[PDB]
Symmetry: C3
Subunit: 88 residues, 3 copies
């Protein structure tokens, strides 16, 4: 079975749903006007997500794992960047 | 092992915990006064959840997956509060 | 297979907590603005979820750790991590 993770923000709301399927994580997006495919596409067998607002600006962190390696992906308004997270 | 997803809201808080076990997802609930089994019962091998407030009203989305098929389930509302009635 | 994670965050700094189940043990990595560090949480589990809420400026965290058909709730309220009253069934 695929594995999903979800976040949301605001009152509209916006929702982002990440799905790990066959070693790849993809993103479906809701901003009030229908589901669409988001920009996020990265390798992983497992996904988690959290997000927070700074005023009206959304920040998202997606944790993608394959084997024992977890990579953090960051959305801070300009598209996705690798974060500093290490699992240790 | 069973797989869970959790969400919470307010400052009481209210918590909802969803558990996928043997292809069924069930819901346990906390609103300050003990754990109880919720109405949510739907098929799934994997679950995620998110929730947001609009004023006092909570809105919940549960993402239930079996195979490659993810179904979104939706609920919302206002929990129990004392009303204006007086016997005057 | 792959490790399994859960994440929560609060405030605007923000603070982030990332729980990882790896080979039957869940550990915690923490961000409070100044670098990632290993947290106090360390308990058994193959699967993990988490939620948290603020009461004013006080964070409260609940981690749901599952092994087999047993899910244990762990509570962070300022007294270390304690076992909560959650059970999966009546
Ligand atoms: C916030 C939205 O709520 C309903 O409109 C659903 O049909 C959508 O899929 C979304 O969850
Ligand atoms: C907040 C951002 O919203 C859309 O632009 C998506 O395409 C990105 O992947 C991200 O989720
Ligand atoms: C909130 C922080 O944002 C960026 O600085 C990342 O590189 C960190 O790992 C963290 O996610
Ligand atoms: C909120 C707390 O932050 C750090 O003190 C961690 O070591 C604890 O495990 C908890 O996450
Ligand atoms: C919010 C509540 O906090 C404690 O009372 C736990 O024992 C409960 O199970 C619940 O998590
Ligand atoms: C918010 C709602 O609380 C109720 O008591 C539950 O039975 C519903 O399934 C839902 O979680």
């Amino acid at each position: 079975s695929v594995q999903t993770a979800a976040t949301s923000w605001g009152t509209v709301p916006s929702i982002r749903v990440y799905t790990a399927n066959n070693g790849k994580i993809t993103e479906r997006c809701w901003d009030g006007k229908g589901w669409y495919t988001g920009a996020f596409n990265e390798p992983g067998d497992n996904v988690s997500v959290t997000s927070w607002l700074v005023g009206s600006a959304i920040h998202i962190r997606v944790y993608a794992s394959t084997g024992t390696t977890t990579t953090e992906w960051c959305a801070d308004g300009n598209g996705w960047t690798k974060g500093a997270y290490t699992a240790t």
